[PDB]
Amino acid sequence: MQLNPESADLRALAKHLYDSYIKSFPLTKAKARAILTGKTTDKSPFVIYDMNSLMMGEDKMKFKHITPLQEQSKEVAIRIFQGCQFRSVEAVQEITEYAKSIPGFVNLDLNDQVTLLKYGVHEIIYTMLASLMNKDGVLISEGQGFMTREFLKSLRKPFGDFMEPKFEFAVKFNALELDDSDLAIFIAVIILSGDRPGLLNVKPIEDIQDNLLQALELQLKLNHPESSQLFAKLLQKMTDLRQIVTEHVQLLQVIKKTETDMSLHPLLQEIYKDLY
Numbered sequence: 169m170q171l172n173p174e175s176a177d178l179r180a181l182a183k184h185l186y187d188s189y190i191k192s193f194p195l196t197k198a199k200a201r202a203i204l205t206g207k208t209t210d211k212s213p214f215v216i217y218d219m220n221s222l223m224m225g226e227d228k229m230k231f232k233h234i235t236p237l238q239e240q241s242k243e244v245a246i247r248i249f250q251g252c253q254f255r256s257v258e259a260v261q262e263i264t265e266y267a268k269s270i271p272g273f274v275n276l277d278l279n280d281q282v283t284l285l286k287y288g289v290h291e292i293i294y295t296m297l298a299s300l301m302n303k304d305g306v307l308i309s310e311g312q313g314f315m316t317r318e319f320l321k322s323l324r325k326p327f328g329d330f331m332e333p334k335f336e337f338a339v340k341f342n343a344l345e346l347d348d349s350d351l352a353i354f355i356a357v358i359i360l361s362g363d364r365p366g367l368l369n370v371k372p373i374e375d376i377q378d379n380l381l382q383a384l385e386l387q388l389k390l391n392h393p394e395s396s397q398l399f400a401k402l403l404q405k406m407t408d409l410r411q412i413v414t415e416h417v418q419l420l421q422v423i424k425k426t427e428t429d430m431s432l433h434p435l436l437q438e439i440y441k442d443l444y
């Protein structure tokens with residue numbers, strides 16, 4: 169391998185994406201792991217590990233109050249539902265801002281830009297959610313709370329099924345030990361998929377993804393020298409991301425049919441509309 173104009177341009181591309189990733193996503197993997205491993209000495213997340221602690225964390229986590237004369241299981245489900253919805257809407261905006269910085273993206277046909285974001289955002293959301301997870305739980309509300317996996321799993325059906333595929337993915341994904349510099353290129357690779365349904369100009373997207381893939385391959389070689397076949401293993405993880413989306417869509421459809429007063433935010437409806 170040589171540090172020639174080709175590879176140097178790949179490094180400059182990796183740096184450009186890292187810088188735009190830092191600008192677009194306030195809570196990076198580096199900051200989240202610091203919090204999760206207790207490196208933040210003064211301010212620490214409140215832990216939500218059961219019903220009692222969820223209701224004691226209402227103020228810190230922006231949850232509507234739950235009085236003692238309500239169906240506790242139902243109201244908690246609503247709070248978690250609204251909480252995830254708020255976060256997803258914010259996350260779409262961060263990813264959209266990020267995508268505009270991907271070299272070549274803004275030059276694509278505007279309809280193809282929208283199609284790529286439509287099919288990409290949720291896969292990126294689940295990838296970056298893993299940065300905020302360990303086997304115990306997930307950081308929420310800008311890292312001010314930590315909600316446990318078993319608590320999310322105990323919610324009344326169908327709500328208690330929602331997060332488990334995300335945690336199972338995160339544990340395997342986090343064992344790859346990627347850092348923010350790796351992730352910035354990987355999420356660009358997710359976006360620039362030439363196989364999204366309804367793309368008009370496939371060739372310009374593939375040429376960009378080919379370049380991103382080259383950048384990711386070089387990044388992993390330089391940053392993880394003794395991690396054998398890390399590139400291959402990371403690409404296989406895209407298989408799991410797509411299944412997360414598939415199951416999540418199905419669970420949301422159960423909610424649309426068998427639940428009241430939990431309609432999706434309009435932006436999320438537009439993303440899910442005619443998706444696959």
Ligand SMILES: CN(CCOc1ccc(C[C@H](Nc2ccccc2C(=O)c2ccccc2)C(=O)O)cc1)c1ccccn1
Pocket residue numbers: 247248249250251252253255256293297306307308309315327330331416432433436
């Ligand atoms: C666990 N979590 C971290 C963020 O988790 C996410 C988990 C999933 C998502 C994606 C997002 N999900 C929803 C969007 C709208 C309404 C509900 C959901 C749920 O996902 C949901 C549904 C039923 C029961 C529970 C959740 C999407 O599809 O756009 C985005 C974020 C929380 C929890 C409470 C408050 C804030 N943070």
Ligand SMILES: [Cl-]
Pocket residue numbers: 391392393394395
């Ligand atoms: Cl290594």
